[PDB]
Amino acid sequence: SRYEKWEKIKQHYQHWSDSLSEEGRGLLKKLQIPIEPKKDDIIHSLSQEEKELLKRIQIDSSDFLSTEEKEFLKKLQIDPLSEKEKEFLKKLKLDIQPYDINQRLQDTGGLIDSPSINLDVRKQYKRDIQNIDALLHQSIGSTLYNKIYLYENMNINNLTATLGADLVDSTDNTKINRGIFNEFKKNFKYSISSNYMIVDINERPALDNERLKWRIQLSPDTRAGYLENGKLILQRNIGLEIKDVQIIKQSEKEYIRIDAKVVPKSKIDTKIQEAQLNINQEWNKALGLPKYTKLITFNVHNRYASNIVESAYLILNEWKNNIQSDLIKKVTNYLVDGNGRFVFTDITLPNIAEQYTHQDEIYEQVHSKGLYVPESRSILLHGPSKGVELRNDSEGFIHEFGHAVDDYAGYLLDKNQSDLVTNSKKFIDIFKEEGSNLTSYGRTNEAEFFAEAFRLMHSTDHAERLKVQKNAPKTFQFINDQIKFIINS
């Protein structure tokens, strides 16, 4: 019933559609099609000293910028890297972001009061989101929820950028990597929508690397609204249980079918909160910690929810396997002493309180794979993203732990000043000598060099550990000496 199904859903919402004020209609158009910044407005605002710098900058080169950002900055220039130009780019990237309601909701996971954007824009988002919420008052009904499926095509990179890089067979792009497919689906049991899903009443062909084809069954009380050309907008904050994930073929090309069922969001948050208790009990006992120490935090709000939860077990297992238990215990106890956390999340790190409470300047806020914040003594690990030159999340976690080791070691040396051990005169000299002998990112500064060397020294690939010894022998010696010192103290 291709056209029949469309007509009757449209009929169901016909009064709702007619009663929409233009203000409301503009809100829904703004939501589907975000407002891009005007390239000519941005350029007019610049001073040519900055424009001179902006020309000198190789846009396609940076690891700081997204693909979307790169294209806009490449398109705009038609009219390593210094400390000043990065400072410039930190501020500039704030002024080139589209007004994107659904992106704001996904980035914050619904926590829209998070101080990760300017107060005026934050309030504008808050207002539009509350107004959209009020528009979506009419549920789909018990007549329709059962007769209908709704469809959504998705890029795998929105769920996991790490697995997304390898999902499609490189030899033959008509095929899905079976091994990668398995990793993707293995722990995919539930999903959370914190923004407004825009779904198709009838399934569409998959365009532009959208290999994920969702088939979604609505709940009777699922609030929605009809959109032009056979689409529906769904309420935010709904839950989805994954019923089946299969490789399917459409037009001689392999895609992934994801069958999901709408459930209440409260139902899934319960699972996440129980899992948080389960993983803390496992690791409090394993770490010799008080029974009710809350060290591990799940900050989960988006569409790859269950995987963030499940991967946290695997990440911490790898962490335990590759690092001396005594080191792990001493450093973690130091973090617990400062109310630190292991935060596993699928919202952007600027929206994590462990960072933003200590970083008020938005241009100084960081989003990335992982982060260590000394002020809160916390490790933050962002699931959906792909770290630069990282294989996986585990290697990413160990690098951050290296920062914590750097932190704790500096504290032990001077309990009054509590600086990083990488700020010591001794290590700065070592960085000056061996700074360029390891990873490209390790060249950045003393802290990064230490964390990168630490990560490589505890890699599952023992060829990597021996490489540090051979290429950066003094760094290797220094870190091993820091580890001894931490453990013996």
Ligand X SMILES: Cc1cc(S(=O)(=O)N(Cc2cccc(N)c2)[C@H](C)C(=O)NO)ccc1F
- Mind telling me the catalytic residues? 400
Query: Is residue 441 a known part of a binding site?
Result: yes
Q: Give the whole-angstrom CA distance, residue 64 versus residue 352.
A: 19
- Tell me which stretch binds Zn ion (CB under 5 A): 23-31, 134-142, 309-317, 443-451: 443-451
Is the CB of 17 or the CB of 66 nearer to ligand X?
Answer: 66
Considering the rule CB under 6 A, would residue 383 count as an interface residue with ligand X?
no
Query: Is residue 382 a known part of a binding site?
Result: no
In the DSSP assignment, the letter for residue 147 is: T
Q: Give the whole-angstrom CA distance, residue 162 versus residue 219.
A: 32
Bridge partners for 378 per DSSP: 373
Is the CB of 269 or the CB of 346 nearer to ligand X?
Answer: 346
Considering the rule CB under 6 A, would residue 64 count as an interface residue with ligand X?
yes
Q: Other C-beta atoms within 10 Å of 22: how many?
A: 7
Q: Give the whole-angstrom CA distance, residue 248 versus residue 103.
A: 29
Structure tokens at 110: 């619904």
Query: Is residue 464 a known part of a binding site?
Result: no
**Ranges assigned E (strand) in 237-369:** 238-249, 254-263, 296-299, 342-345
Is the CB of 295 or the CB of 451 nearer to Zn ion?
Answer: 451
Considering the rule CB under 6 A, would residue 461 count as an interface residue with ligand X?
no
Of the candidate residues 368, 392, 460, 469, the single one contacting ligand X (CB under 6 A):
368
388 binds, among ligand X, Zn ion, none (CB under 5 to 8 A by kind): ligand X
Q: Other C-beta atoms within 10 Å of 21: how many?
A: 9
Q: Give the whole-angstrom CA distance, residue 37 versus residue 39.
A: 6
Considering the rule CB under 6 A, would residue 371 count as an interface residue with ligand X?
yes
Of the candidate residues 7, 36, 63, 113, the single one contacting ligand X (CB under 6 A):
63
371 binds, among ligand X, Zn ion, none (CB under 5 to 8 A by kind): ligand X
Is the CB of 269 or the CB of 407 nearer to ligand X?
Answer: 407
Instruction: Tell how far CA 261 is from the center of its chain.
Output: 24
Structure tokens at 278: 């389960």
**Ranges assigned E (strand) in 203-295:** 212-217, 224-227, 231-234, 238-249, 254-263
Lookup result for tokens 């989805």: 240
The kind and range of the H/E element at 204 are none
Task: For the CB of residue 202, give the shortest distance to Zn ion in the complex, in Å.
Answer: 47
Query: Is residue 403 a known part of a binding site?
Result: yes
Q: Are 53 and 84 contacting, i.e. CB atoms less than 8 angstroms apart?
A: yes
Rounded to the nearest 10 degrees, the angle between the axes of helix 473-488 and helix 425-434 is 150
Residues 292-331 contacting ligand X, CB under 6 A: none
Considering the rule CB under 6 A, would residue 468 count as an interface residue with ligand X?
no
Of the candidate residues 211, 303, 341, 455, the single one contacting ligand X (CB under 6 A):
455
Task: For the CB of residue 367, give the shortest distance to ligand X in the complex, in Å.
Answer: 6
Of the candidate residues 43, 121, 314, 388, the single one contacting ligand X (CB under 6 A):
388
Is the CB of 254 or the CB of 393 nearer to ligand X?
Answer: 393
Task: For the CB of residue 39, give the shortest distance to ligand X in the complex, in Å.
Answer: 24
Is the CB of 330 or the CB of 386 nearer to ligand X?
Answer: 386
Q: Which residues contact 229 (CB under 8 A, 6 or more apart)?
A: none
Considering the rule CB under 6 A, would residue 370 count as an interface residue with ligand X?
yes
- Tell me which stretch binds Zn ion (CB under 5 A): 40-48, 211-219, 297-305, 444-452: 444-452
- Tell me which stretch binds ligand X (CB under 6 A): 99-107, 166-174, 204-212, 397-405: 397-405
Bridge partners for 231 per DSSP: 200, 227
370 binds, among Zn ion, ligand X, none (CB under 5 to 8 A by kind): ligand X
Structure tokens at 170: 């490189």
Is the CB of 64 or the CB of 313 nearer to Zn ion?
Answer: 64
369 binds, among ligand X, Zn ion, none (CB under 5 to 8 A by kind): ligand X
Residue 72, judged by CB atoms within 10 A of its CB (0-12, 13-18, 19+), counts as buried
251: left (phi over 0), alpha (psi -120 to 50) or beta: left
Task: For the CB of residue 373, give the shortest distance to ligand X in the complex, in Å.
Answer: 10
The kind and range of the H/E element at 198 are strand 198-200
Considering the rule CB under 6 A, would residue 389 count as an interface residue with ligand X?
yes
Can you say which residues are annotated as belonging to the binding site?
399, 403, 441, 448
Instruction: By CB under 6 A, name the binding residues for ligand X.
Output: 63-64, 366, 368-372, 387-390, 395-396, 399-400, 403, 441, 448, 455
